[PDB]
Design an enzyme around this catalytic site. Structure first.
Site, PDB file in Angstrom:
ATOM      1  N   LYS A  58       1.130  -0.962   0.268  1.00  0.00           N
ATOM      2  CA  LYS A  58      -0.285  -0.145  -0.102  1.00  0.00           C
ATOM      3  C   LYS A  58       0.795   1.270   0.609  1.00  0.00           C
ATOM      4  O   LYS A  58       0.993   2.377  -0.555  1.00  0.00           O
ATOM      5  CB  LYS A  58      -0.867   0.446   1.149  1.00  0.00           C
ATOM      6  CG  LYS A  58      -2.158   0.989   1.508  1.00  0.00           C
ATOM      7  CD  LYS A  58      -2.813   0.890   2.633  1.00  0.00           C
ATOM      8  CE  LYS A  58      -4.220   2.060   2.150  1.00  0.00           C
ATOM      9  NZ  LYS A  58      -4.710   1.463   3.540  1.00  0.00           N
TER      10      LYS A  58
ATOM     11  N   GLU B  72     -11.059   5.883   3.273  1.00  0.00           N
ATOM     12  CA  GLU B  72     -11.653   5.496   4.728  1.00  0.00           C
ATOM     13  C   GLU B  72     -12.006   5.967   6.015  1.00  0.00           C
ATOM     14  O   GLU B  72     -13.148   5.563   6.870  1.00  0.00           O
ATOM     15  CB  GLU B  72     -10.129   4.786   4.973  1.00  0.00           C
ATOM     16  CG  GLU B  72      -9.808   3.393   4.370  1.00  0.00           C
ATOM     17  CD  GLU B  72      -8.441   3.520   4.486  1.00  0.00           C
ATOM     18  OE1 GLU B  72      -7.251   3.714   5.647  1.00  0.00           O
ATOM     19  OE2 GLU B  72      -7.533   3.143   3.493  1.00  0.00           O
TER      20      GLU B  72
HETATM   21  N1  LIG Z   1      -6.402  -5.452  20.813  1.00  0.00           N
HETATM   22  C1  LIG Z   1      -5.574  -4.858  20.173  1.00  0.00           C
HETATM   23  N2  LIG Z   1      -4.283  -4.299  21.169  1.00  0.00           N
HETATM   24  C2  LIG Z   1      -3.077  -3.319  20.682  1.00  0.00           C
HETATM   25  N3  LIG Z   1      -3.098  -3.407  19.118  1.00  0.00           N
HETATM   26  C3  LIG Z   1      -4.038  -4.534  18.571  1.00  0.00           C
HETATM   27  C4  LIG Z   1      -5.427  -5.048  19.087  1.00  0.00           C
HETATM   28  N4  LIG Z   1      -5.680  -5.555  17.950  1.00  0.00           N
HETATM   29  C5  LIG Z   1      -4.821  -5.176  16.822  1.00  0.00           C
HETATM   30  N5  LIG Z   1      -3.931  -4.162  17.386  1.00  0.00           N
HETATM   31  C6  LIG Z   1      -2.750  -4.234  16.711  1.00  0.00           C
HETATM   32  O1  LIG Z   1      -3.353  -3.124  15.207  1.00  0.00           O
HETATM   33  C7  LIG Z   1      -2.779  -2.672  14.636  1.00  0.00           C
HETATM   34  C8  LIG Z   1      -3.242  -3.292  12.976  1.00  0.00           C
HETATM   35  O2  LIG Z   1      -4.503  -2.879  12.792  1.00  0.00           O
HETATM   36  P1  LIG Z   1      -5.456  -2.362  11.453  1.00  0.00           P
HETATM   37  O3  LIG Z   1      -6.620  -1.276  12.058  1.00  0.00           O
HETATM   38  O4  LIG Z   1      -6.355  -3.622  11.622  1.00  0.00           O
HETATM   39  O5  LIG Z   1      -4.343  -2.320  10.178  1.00  0.00           O
HETATM   40  P2  LIG Z   1      -4.441  -2.008   9.002  1.00  0.00           P
HETATM   41  O6  LIG Z   1      -6.090  -1.288   8.323  1.00  0.00           O
HETATM   42  O7  LIG Z   1      -3.827  -2.034   8.110  1.00  0.00           O
HETATM   43  N6  LIG Z   1      -3.517  -0.035   9.501  1.00  0.00           N
HETATM   44  P3  LIG Z   1      -2.429   0.921   9.233  1.00  0.00           P
HETATM   45  O8  LIG Z   1      -1.519  -0.387   8.966  1.00  0.00           O
HETATM   46  O9  LIG Z   1      -2.297   1.970   9.348  1.00  0.00           O
HETATM   47  O10 LIG Z   1      -2.710   0.853   7.414  1.00  0.00           O
HETATM   48  C9  LIG Z   1      -1.460  -3.969  14.430  1.00  0.00           C
HETATM   49  O11 LIG Z   1      -0.613  -2.626  15.104  1.00  0.00           O
HETATM   50  C10 LIG Z   1      -2.401  -4.920  15.086  1.00  0.00           C
HETATM   51  O12 LIG Z   1      -1.335  -5.564  16.383  1.00  0.00           O
END
Ligand SMILES: Nc1ncnc2c1ncn2[C@@H]1O[C@H](COP(=O)(O)OP(=O)(O)NP(=O)(O)O)[C@@H](O)[C@H]1O
Ligand SMILES: [Mg+2]
Length: 380
Positions: free
Chosen positions: A69, A173
């Protein structure tokens, strides 16, 4: 007839939802996970996607691709691309000023466009939905950051088409998150909504004005290199020091060991969002030595204190740019898996003088949820 799906194609994790029988259902994958790593891996005999790719990352760093991305829709000469390349374990090459990830696959050198890599992740999300629904999916709404330009949006749509999906629309988003909470429906006049999105690799703050279902981006701020992975990193360095103290050995040179420790830290981190302590157990971490320890939520918070605190500056900045005071914001929406961290929710709530947060939808699922609602609407 067939339901359309909503897909959050994230930098680190992707999520798929479908609106069916009066409700949005976020679909779990083969391993029972509601989100799937945006990872793809190439080996001597196969292509792995999602959890299966991320799970073998320590074994095959050069041919396990992620962060597509960050490259999608950009030119090879783009300063962002040149900068990001310095830190990836996989090779990126120039093909007519377009970046391509080069890897070894089935014993040969092959290169893929960013949209090809993302089409694989999207294909997995499509299969996840089809497994649950029992039938093929061919319509979808895919989301992108509000700041993506035309080229990035085009390439993201291309990824979807390569995956066999008719892309109904590409929407922002933060807009999708607002739709998930039904904020696209308002009483007379405009509403100011702040989306605080802290994911795995990026931090995006967006202020939107909504009026009669019309969304306008008033301000955006953040840091494209601040997210959950950075918190994992603080834990990794903390444990590398603990291992030195306990065994007088420095494991920072062993790539496999550091990667395995990182994977364990991410899991322990997630656990610390619901419980006050977490244990890490890694067999044969380094030179055959097992590493079993624990860490408390408070220690984790201390290790990441500066990073957590820094998330409020872009919020202040976004408010300044939007020319709005905190009290003028009508709704606060939590997006991104990192906003599940209690300390992060406390900082935002405290900054807004006690305001309740829209957090009833898992933050790492909010974008896909809204995308699914939008997709259903578009299907009529
Ligand atoms: N319960 C939780 N507590 C803390 N962190 C979490 C938890 N669940 C997921 N994460 C973290 O959240 C992050 C992923 O967020 P998520 O929004 O699913 O990714 P994304 O959409 O790809 N966001 P981005 O990477 O900025 O494009 C990772 O670092 C996970 O380890
Ligand atoms: Mg995501």
């Amino acid at each position: 007839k067939a339901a359309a799906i909503g897909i959050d194609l994230g930098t680190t994790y992707s999520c798929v939802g479908v609106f069916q029988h009066g409700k949005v259902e976020i679909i779990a994958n083969d391993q029972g996970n509601r989100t799937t790593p945006s990872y793809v891996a190439f080996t001597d005999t196969e292509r792995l996607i999602g959890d299966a790719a991320k799970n073998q990352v320590a074994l095959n760093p050069q041919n396990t691709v992620f962060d597509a991305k960050r490259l999608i829709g950009r030119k090879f000469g783009d300063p962002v691309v040149q900068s990001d390349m310095k830190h990836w374990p996989f090779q990126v090459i120039n093909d007519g000023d377009k970046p391509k990830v080069q890897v070894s696959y089935k014993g040969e050198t092959k290169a893929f466009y960013p949209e090809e890599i993302s089409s694989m992740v999207l294909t997995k999300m499509k299969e996840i939905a089809e497994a649950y629904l029992g039938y093929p999916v061919t319509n979808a709404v895919i989301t992108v950051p509000a700041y993506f330009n035309d080229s990035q949006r085009q390439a993201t749509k291309d990824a979807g088409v390569i995956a066999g999906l008719n892309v109904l629309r590409i929407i922002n988003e933060p807009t999708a998150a607002a739709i998930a909470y039904g904020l696209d429906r308002t009483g007379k006049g405009e509403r100011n909504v702040l989306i605080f999105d802290l994911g795995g690799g990026t931090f995006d703050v967006s202020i939107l004005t909504i009026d009669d279902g019309i969304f306008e981006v008033k301000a955006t701020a953040g840091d494209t290199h601040l997210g959950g992975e950075d918190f994992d990193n603080r834990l990794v360095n903390h444990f590398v020091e603990e291992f030195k103290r306990k065994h007088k050995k420095d494991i920072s040179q062993n790539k496999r060991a550091v990667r395995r420790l990182r994977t364990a830290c991410e899991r322990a981190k997630r656990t610390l969002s619901s419980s006050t302590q977490a244990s890490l157990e890694i067999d044969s971490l380094f030179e055959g030595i097992d590493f079993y320890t624990s860490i408390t939520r408070a220690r984790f918070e201390e290790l990441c204190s500066d990073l957590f605190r820094s998330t409020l500056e872009p919020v202040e900045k976004a408010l300044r740019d939007a020319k709005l005071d905190k009290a003028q914001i009508h709704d606060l929406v939590l997006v991104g898996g990192s906003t599940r961290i209690p300390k992060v929710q406390k900082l935002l709530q405290d900054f807004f003088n006690g305001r309740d947060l829209n957090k009833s939808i898992n933050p790492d699922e909010a974008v896909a949820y809204g995308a699914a609602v939008q997709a259903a609407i578009l299907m009529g």
